Structure 1
Amino acid sequence: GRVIRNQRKGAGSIFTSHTRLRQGAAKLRTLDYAERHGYIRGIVKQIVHDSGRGAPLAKVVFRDPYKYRLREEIFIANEGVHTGQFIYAGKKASLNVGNVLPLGSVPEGTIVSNVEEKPGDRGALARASGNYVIIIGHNPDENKTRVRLPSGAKKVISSDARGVIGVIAGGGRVDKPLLKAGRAFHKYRLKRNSWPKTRGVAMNPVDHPHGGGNHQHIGKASTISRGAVSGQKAGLIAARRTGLLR
C-alpha cells in the first residue's frame, strides 16, 4: 500500500498554511509590571481585516514605560470597539468592553475573550469570531477561577490569567451558505491546502483503507481505536457513540 493523504499532511511540503497576507500574530500585551500593579492606556488606531481569519484585528498603540518610543500590539477586535477608543490594560483597569483585566478581578457572570491559559502566554482561548468565555466561579484560596469555554467545557485556570472583556467581533459568519465551490475555493485559498476532498471510499485500496471493491462501501467498521497506528486512523477515531441522536 501507499502512504495515505492524512499521513502525508504532517511533512508540511504543500500543506503549510499560506501566511503571506497576514498582519502578525494576534497576541496580548506582555505582562510586565504596569499590567500587574496598575493599568496602562493605549489607543485603537485602526481595525483591519486579517487574511484567512474570520474576525477583524485591532491595532492598539501603547507607550513603552521604560524608553521614549511607541509599541504597537495586534489585538483581536471585540464587538463594539471603535477607532480612537482608549483601551485599558492592567489589574486596576475598569470593567468595560475592550479592557484587558485579569480574571481574578472580574465578578460572576463576566463574559471575556482572548483568555490566557496560564498567566503570560498572551491569549489562547475564545479567539475565533463570535466566541467567548464565561466566568463561572472564583476560588480565592488556591487562587483559581472556573470558566465555561466555547465548547461547553469547564476549565479551572489561574486567577492571574488575562482576558479581553466582551465577545469577538465578526460573529454569525457560518450562518451564511457558501453556495459555491468557488466560494469554498477562495475561503481555503488563504488558509491552507485542504480542499477539495476526495472520499477515501472512492479510491483504490492502495491509497486508503476505504478504497476498492466492486461497490463503494467501507468494508469494516469506520470507528477506529485510539491505539491504532498511522495509516489506520481514517474514519471516526475513538467514537464513544455514532449516529444522529433525537
Structure 2
Amino acid sequence: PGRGAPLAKVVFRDPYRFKKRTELFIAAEGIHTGQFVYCGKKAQLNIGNVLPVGTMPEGTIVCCLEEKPGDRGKLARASGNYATVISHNPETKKTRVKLPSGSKKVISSANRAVVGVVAGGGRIDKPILKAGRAYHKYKAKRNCWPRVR
C-alpha cells in the first residue's frame, strides 16, 4: 500500500546457521513466483539478479541501485523507473550511471543493483478522472491531497 511498484518476497538460505532468510526485494518487471534469483559478484545478467554495477557491461540498465557501496537499494525504486550503467574505470573503482531524472552520477563499482526495469509499468498514463479516486490514492499515502490554493 502507498506505492505503485509490486514487492517481491524472496527466500534465501542463511549461509551460517540453519534458517531461512526472507527478503522484500522490489519486483523488477518480468520476474515470477517460483523463479530463482541470484545475488552476488558471480551472478549472471538476468532480470531480477542482483550484482555489482562494476561487473556489468557498458549499456545495461538496473532497477534498485545503491547510492553508497553497502546500503540497500536507494535509486530507481519507483514503478517503471530504471538507471543506466554508462561507463566504468577500473582504476579508482568508479562507475558512471544515468538516473531517472536524467542526471549523471559517479558511484562506487561495488554498488549492487537489480537487473531490469521495476514493475508497475506506465501507472501515470491512466487519468485519475475522479476526486474520489484521488482521495483513495492519497489515503494510503499521507494527508496531503485536497490542496487549497
TM-score by length of 1: 0.60
> Counterparts in 2 of 1:1-246, with a 5 A limit?
51-199=1-149
Corresponding residue SS for 1:142: helix
Corresponding residue SS for 1:101: strand
Q: Structure 1, residues 158-177: CA drift from partner, whole Å, max 9, x if none?
A: 00000000000011000000
Paired residue total: 149
- Structure number with greater CO (CA < 8 Å, separation at least 6) is 2
Q: Structure 1 CA distance, aligned partners of 2:148 and 2:96?
A: 42
TM-score by length of 2: 0.99
Corresponding residue SS for 2:21: strand
Name stretches of at least 5 consecutive residues in structure 2 with no aligned partner. none
* Residue 195 (structure 1) shift: 1.1
Counterpart of 2:68, as a letter, is: K
Once superposed, what is the RMSD of the aligned Cα atoms?
0.4
Name stretches of at least 5 consecutive residues in structure 1 with no aligned partner. 1-50, 200-246
Corresponding residue SS for 2:67: coil
User: Any runs of at least 4 consecutive aligned residues in structure 1 with deviations exceeding 4 A, and if so which?
Assistant: none
* Residue 120 (structure 1) shift: 1.1
Q: Structure 2 CA distance, aligned partners of 1:95 and 1:169?
A: 18
